[PDB]
Amino acid sequence: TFDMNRVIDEFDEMTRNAHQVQKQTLKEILLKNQSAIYLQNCGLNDPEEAFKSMVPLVTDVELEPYIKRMVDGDTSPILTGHPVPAISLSSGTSQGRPKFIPFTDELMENTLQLFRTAFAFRNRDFPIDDNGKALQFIFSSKQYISTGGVPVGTATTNVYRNPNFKAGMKSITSPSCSPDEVIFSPDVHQALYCHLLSGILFRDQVQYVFAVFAHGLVHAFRTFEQVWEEIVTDIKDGVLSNRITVPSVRTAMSKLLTPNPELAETIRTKCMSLSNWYGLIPALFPNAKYVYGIMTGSMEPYVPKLRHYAGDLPLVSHDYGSSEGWIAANVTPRLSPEEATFAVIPNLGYFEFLPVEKPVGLTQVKIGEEYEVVITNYAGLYRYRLGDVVKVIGFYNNTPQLKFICRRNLILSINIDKNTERDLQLSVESAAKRLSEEKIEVIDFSSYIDVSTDPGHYAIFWEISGETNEDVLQDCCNCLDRAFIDAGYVSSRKCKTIGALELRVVAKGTFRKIQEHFLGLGKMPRCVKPSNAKVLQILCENVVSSYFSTAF
């Protein structure tokens, strides 16, 4: 039974005792998983001491073969003491291959604990009506079964399809406007339309608006700009647009629709009153208290447009975690996304921090210093290098408050996509075999994030060893686009939040000219940063042709 003050007091005591809770949490993780051959092979059977001397830092790549066994249905103890109920398909890759992370019942408990904690602080500073609803733009369009018989989904999908999700969120959320059939629609574009319509149908009750990521909220209302008159028509007629073809979705939404020309008129008058859609969100939902979602890190570029739609509504930052697990909660919800920091929850894992040198404990980190995060938790992860670099902004009682700084080895990112030099090189090598058919080779390559388009897209620069046809180059272009298998990139391309990959072919001698540039001053950049004007200049002025992927 949820009690706001009780929840806050519990978080307070835990963070006052963060050092002790860290140690107790490690001991419990090690007890639960002691039969895991990964742990047995380290010499485990001074528990904290033994742990740090016997267990090596490890990377996703090192864990790949172990996790592969779990995805293939091995139920003996490998990374966990008990068989996992699901596997999470993560963003990013494992050396260019799909990256999987175990999803355990404990991770579900953690999710519920963190949501409850964050809600308590948020509802303290931004109290909502408990007879209202929320507009929640969430999606779980798919969860497949591995060949070994294990469910595989994204982390959010594993959360949304958990048997404890509805009951567990009941007390610490405002009820969604959307039918479950919308959330689980196999077609996310239809789901999004229906979320928008559902929100409008209950607009007076909507207490806040949520999506996991800021770019999702922005995409939602950009979409509204396109379909608003269609929604007004659906409401006026009490008939769902023929755009919606998923039968279970049509059925569910039809129960909510009856002819309402009055509401339709209100909405039409309201939309036409806006100036370039400024303040669209509070206009549609005049009782919403805030907009909620991840506003930080890779989402920072989306905040200006989100503010535009949000008008004067507070933007509240959603918490810090990934497919690997949760780390930190926003307990200062009134702070803008620029000032937002996240307090580590001391029982969600045994956290270590590599100085940006060997790792220090949670209560050992220093204000103003940057560290790479190291995770030991209930996801089968022991001293796992997350690759996230954080800065310690301060302490909330004895737990550090963190700001995300950067992700190591990342060169290509628009929103939720994460691609490295190796991923780019692999995509190039894939697409190059279409060229090899023509006895043509890739002389060199680079790339660039083009955010002049909406949405932004990847641009790849190629110089090739000979002239070829448009069809060949079109194929190479499509292949480059499909060769990026990172789940984040694929998810965005499908949801249209990342545009068609563009292949720009440059004139012969273009890359040598870049060499000449650097030689006349005295390692080819694989993604050209916006500030690298001299290099960008040489590439752009030598583009001779341009192609856009017809994939997705």
Closest by CA position to 208, among listed 168, 170, 175, 257: 175
- List the beta strands (DSSP E) in 422-538: 442-450, 457-464, 502-506
Is 160 one of the annotated binding-site residues? yes
**What tokens appear for 60 in the block?**
């996703």
Give the footprint of ligand JAI on residues 112-141 (CB under 6 A): none
Is 154 one of the annotated binding-site residues? no
Beta strands 206-213 and 290-294 are parallel
Report the residue number, 111 or 401, with the smaller CB distance to ligand JAI.
111
- Contact residue for ligand JAI among 17, 24, 75, 156 (CB under 6 A): 156
Strand order of the β-sheet with 350-355 is 320-322, 325-329, 342-344, 399-407, 384-396, 370-376, 350-355, 360-361
Give the footprint of ligand JAI on residues 96-115 (CB under 6 A): 107, 111
- Percentages (nearest 5) of helix, strand, coil residues in the chain: 40, 20, 35
Task: Give me the helices (H) in 170-278, please.
Answer: 180-183, 188-201, 214-237, 247-254, 261-273
Site string for ligand JAI, 47-86 (x = CB under 6 A): ----------------------------------------
Least distance in angstroms from the C-beta of 488 to ligand JAI: 5
Sign, Cα dihedral of 190, 193, 199, 200: negative
- Contact residue for ligand JAI among 91, 205, 298, 413 (CB under 6 A): 91
Give the footprint of ligand JAI on residues 405-424 (CB under 6 A): 416
C-alpha–C-alpha distance, residues 322 and 332, integer Å: 20
Cis amide linkage into residue 77, ω under 30° from 0: no
Report the residue number, 101 or 246, with the smaller CB distance to ligand JAI.
101
Beta strands 315-317 and 290-294 are parallel
Choices 231-239, 273-281, 350-358, 487-495; region in contact with ligand JAI by CB under 6 A: 487-495
Give the footprint of ligand JAI on residues 307-326 (CB under 6 A): 321-323, 325-326
Least distance in angstroms from the C-beta of 418 to ligand JAI: 7
CB atoms within 10 A of CB 450: 15
Report the residue number, 323 or 376, with the smaller CB distance to ligand JAI.
323
Least distance in angstroms from the C-beta of 416 to ligand JAI: 5
- Contact residue for ligand JAI among 29, 63, 128, 159 (CB under 6 A): 159
Least distance in angstroms from the C-beta of 91 to ligand JAI: 3
Q: Which DSSP symbol is given to 416?
A: S
Is 88 one of the annotated binding-site residues? yes
360, amino acid identity: V
195, amino acid identity: H
Number of residues that bind ligand JAI (CB under 6 A): 18
Is 72 one of the annotated binding-site residues? no
276, amino acid identity: N
Least distance in angstroms from the C-beta of 543 to ligand JAI: 32
- In the complex, which residue's CB is closest to ligand JAI? 91
Is 91 one of the annotated binding-site residues? yes
- Contact residue for ligand JAI among 93, 117, 154, 478 (CB under 6 A): 154
Report the residue number, 333 or 488, with the smaller CB distance to ligand JAI.
488
Closest by CA position to 105, among listed 164, 173, 25: 164
Q: Does 390 bind ligand JAI (CB under 6 A)?
A: no
Q: Is-contact 279 311, C-beta < 8 A?
A: yes
C-alpha–C-alpha distance, residues 272 and 276, integer Å: 10
Q: Which DSSP symbol is given to 91?
A: E
Positions at the binding site for jasmonate? 91, 318-321
**Residues of each annotated binding site:** 88, 91, 108, 111, 153, 156-160, 318-326, 513-517, 534
- Report the binding-site residues for an L-alpha-amino acid: 156-160, 513-517
The site for ligand JAI (CB under 6 A) is made up of: 90-91, 107, 111, 154-156, 159, 212, 321-323, 325-326, 416, 487-488, 491
